[PDB]
Amino acid sequence: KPAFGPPDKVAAQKFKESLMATEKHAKDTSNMWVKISVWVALPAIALTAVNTYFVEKEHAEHREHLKHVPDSEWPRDYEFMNIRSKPFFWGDGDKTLFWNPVVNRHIEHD
Amino acid sequence: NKVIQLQKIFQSSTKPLWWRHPRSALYLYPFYAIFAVAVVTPLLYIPNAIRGIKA
Amino acid sequence: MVQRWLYSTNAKDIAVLYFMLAIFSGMAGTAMSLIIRLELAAPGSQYLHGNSQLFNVLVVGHAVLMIFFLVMPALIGGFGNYLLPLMIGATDTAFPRINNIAFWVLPMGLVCLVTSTLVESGAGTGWTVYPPLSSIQAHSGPSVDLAIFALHLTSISSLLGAINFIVTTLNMRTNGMTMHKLPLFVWSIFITAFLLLLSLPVLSAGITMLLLDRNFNTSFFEVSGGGDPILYEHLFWFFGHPEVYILIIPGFGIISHVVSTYSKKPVFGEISMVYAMASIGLLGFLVWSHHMYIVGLDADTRAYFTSATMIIAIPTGIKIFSWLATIHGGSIRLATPMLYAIAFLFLFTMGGLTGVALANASLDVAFHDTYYVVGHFHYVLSMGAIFSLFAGYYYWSPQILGLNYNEKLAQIQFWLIFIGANVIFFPMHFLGINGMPRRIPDYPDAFAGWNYVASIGSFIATLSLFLFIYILYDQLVNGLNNKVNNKSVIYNKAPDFVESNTIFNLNTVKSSSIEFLLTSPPAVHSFNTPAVQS
Amino acid sequence: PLHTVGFDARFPQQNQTKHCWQSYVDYHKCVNMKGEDFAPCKVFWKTYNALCPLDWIEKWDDQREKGIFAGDIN
Amino acid sequence: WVITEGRRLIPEIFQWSAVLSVCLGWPGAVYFFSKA
Amino acid sequence: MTHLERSRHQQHPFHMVMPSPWPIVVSFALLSLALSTALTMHGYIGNMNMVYLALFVLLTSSILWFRDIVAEATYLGDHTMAVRKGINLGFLMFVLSEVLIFAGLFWAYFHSAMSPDVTLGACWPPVGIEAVQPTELPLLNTIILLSSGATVTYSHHALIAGNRNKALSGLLITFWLIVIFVTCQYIEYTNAAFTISDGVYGSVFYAGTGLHFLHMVMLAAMLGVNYWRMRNYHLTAGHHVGYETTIIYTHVLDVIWLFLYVVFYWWGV
Amino acid sequence: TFEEFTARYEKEFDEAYDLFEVQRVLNNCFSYDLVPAPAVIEKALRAARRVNDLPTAIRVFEALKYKVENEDQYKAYLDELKDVRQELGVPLKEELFP
Ligand code: HEA
Ligand code: HEA
Ligand SMILES: [Ca+2]
């Protein structure tokens, strides 16, 4: 009836101590990564977000300047520029998934 | 949390696993209605495409 | 019942479904070959009025149905699903629920393929769907779009099946089966799954690139836009040459197991056999552009690909000789599986010599895109992979089904298919050396000689297939009576010289695998208490 | 009395698309940019009129005129 | 060993040359019988 | 343990799943998507209302497949140690296939970059294309993605340690720091000068980053289901396989971004 | 070596406790490339008498006849084994005419 043999009692106390050893190693190494996050990751994002914020506004004024004057018409397209082998099925004939009418025009020079 | 009382319900149910939870009737019934429309409607356009009529 | 077959989780039922789909697609794809032979029997358009379309469409359908719907589901999904768990000793596969979706996405591909054929255009592009001809300007219908979708479904089926076999082999073995001590069929399946895993994604990327270029306006291969139609060749054949080895490596395990049971002596040098089997798979990834010799590559890369492809013959030859060394001393039992294996040993070596003849880039400028190559790959496919499929069926069916199959009526089928296929595929090398191109429906008159002979031989093989269907019917119906009368052979191993008839009847099966020790048919739950080895 | 373009270093192989293209670019930069001498420019002119398909020339002639030539002639 | 091997070896080479001439030389029959 | 008791349990460590209808329901949903998409591309329907329906059914059926997996692992408890190794091994073999899909996309980039085509300019990128500037905005995404790997690491070890306020906070920052990547990538796509239709350059550019973009949206969903399961006491301190495969997924997906940042952004301008 | 071979099957046959073991050892002795020495065969005959099986003793020479490969060497084995065979009573196949 006993099925299994006598308990090892040596695998135990070597399995039940590795669990304590594992959680102890995760306890302090977690504190190490928190120190890295606050003292390395957080300053890095703050010093690159303030830079990107300023450069982004410089681009924004350029983009709204395009609409103001067509002037000399939009730059002409090379032979590989706009490919219309088969018109798009979603809506009008020639507009891609993300279209910004400000910067994408596709004027036809016939 | 509720895992202990959810464990006692899923075990000892003698029902399909997707019908055991008491809230399962809300998902399954609307699903089979939409599912039928999804797998039968494209099959109606097959003979229309074979003839060549474009809608 | 719906639950048993529509909600399948048992691996043996999925194997039976894979088998059942394979025969239907096999009969469907071998009638298009009959129509092709009838159209090529004589010069001039004889049966198809003048339609060059519906000839290329039939060729595409034939190739796809024979490769992706007969050999793949039978060798890998049929035999691999049914036999790998049993020889390893696992009760079922590691992921039993994705094993069902690995099958049920195959019938959807058949619907996509048929509805692609029925649209007014059709897909006359070949099984290698090259971009510029299958672009939107030359094939303007929704046909090749539906053909591409079928390839995605087959690819996802094969990928999900391949992931299942790697995990199943690695950590579902029994109590004594170390990775060093495996049957050779499991080794072949393992290596095949690893080739599939690393080769399928590149095909998926190229095929999706083709789809997006036809419908989403991406200059992926469009010449006007900087695209290169030769990049597609690299992307496709990187899955293409390794592929010709997914269809033969599981064919090697079957032959390895067959020739050591009806020849009562174990395989000569097994570890060298697994080394050579792994080397063919590993080194086949370094030779893909021999299919692209005349595309205009550099002179120095042609030398590399010529030198690397001939190394394939070193391990391959090792497998040919080690098969001839395990039958040298033993006692030979000439049954139907042994007749198929012996025919395979000869026909595959005839195919491989022509293959090494094709491997030289300087000579391939005279043998490329001719019927020479067709005759080549019809020896290793129609006589190398089909024969091991017949040998595997005749080897395992009485154990799997529990029904015998009237030996003398099967040897007739063997001889008919032998002398029928040899008639179709031997004259092709004569047509190829005179410069007869591929993929044409009608040819100059001077080629009418061997084409008639090859067309006569197709009817013999078709008659053999019909006889095989009748053998299936006579096995399922009154097959329990075949082992009562004297129509079939019951024991695959005769007693030894000094072994009496009353001692053979207490040790009936002296096998080196668990497959032949199970009940016939095997139980639904085969292994309750795990089996122990060594 | 037969002759043709000789073997060229840098273009020693089967693929010859760039060899055609460079001669067309070189020819126009030979004339518009410091075209002080007629004779040396003819080496390219007999080199792209050879080895190059005809219809490519008319396509590149329209793209140059319209201002959409990829090559930098100036 | 010369006496024993001779009784079995040499007849087989003659049978050998026959079968291989059939599997490989069969298309010669069709061409001659009536290339016409 | 009595011999009678042991026989009232499985004799093997592998998990036997009951018959299920989802493997075929997803199969039928994949045919409707394949068959409806092939029609709307050429007409034959008229509007794109059936494509949306097919995608919805495809997604909803997949949710009900994952809904069953969490039930048999958390309430029925069929994931023994042997089963857990196969799931981890199966995911590792699945990310290798994902990498090789990207390997086919880098090959397409190097083919047209090392020897640029003649229909393009003699140079690369082609003449008249304003490529994305590597230092202004993509560099913000690079710092963001690296910081995601640092905050999911101590969220993982805090869960092992035993405190739930740091583990729960690490995921919340991880989710919102991935959403910022998706929204910032959305801003650049709608402000770019070139489109997918701009020759070969736009095809390879938007296929590499676009495939990564579609993978980041599936990463946020995976992170979202770990926050629900952690908050409602599903993930335990020593058994979390749905979370280990998420940490491997985000670390592997940072290496792929670094490779896409060196060749598509720096080396390609 | 041959002498080591002969002296180790001379010991294997002396320990064969049933009719399954005798037919297992003799299938091993004749499975080797070498034709066994006449000293080996004599012990095999004794084993068959010990387990009381006449037909396996008859098959000993039938195995030898195909194994010895020489028409005079079969006579050479025949002459030295005349005394033991006649004493035991084993008939040859040709004499028996079965
Ligand atoms: C199961 C299928 C299968 C197998 C196993 C092979 C095996 C080989 N194949 Fe190929 N092959 C195809 C299927 C296969 N092939 C298909 C379908 C095509 C055409 C695809 C298409 O274009 O549509 C093709 C095309 C193909 C080409 C391209 C031809 C062209 O398109 O111009 C080449 C080039 O070298 C090639 C070579 C080889 C070689 C060297 C082997 C080697 O593996 C063979 C090695 C065999 C031997 C070496 C003989 C056995 C060994 C001995 C007897 C030992 C003694 C040997 C020596 C001393 C050398 N075959
Ligand atoms: C497994 C692959 C396979 C098989 C079995 C076959 C079998 C046959 N094929 Fe071939 N064929 C190809 C793969 C195959 N083929 C490929 C890839 C091409 C290239 C297409 C292209 O150019 O695009 C091709 C092209 C091809 C051509 C050249 C077309 C062209 O270039 O224009 C011809 C010409 O006669 C031909 C004829 C035949 C004939 C008469 C048979 C058969 O009659 C031969 C005898 C075999 C059988 C009758 C099958 C028996 C077995 C079963 C039916 C399965 C059931 C059995 C078990 C489960 C054990 N097929
Ligand atoms: Ca005809």
Ligand SMILES: [Cu+2]
């Ligand atoms: Cu190849």
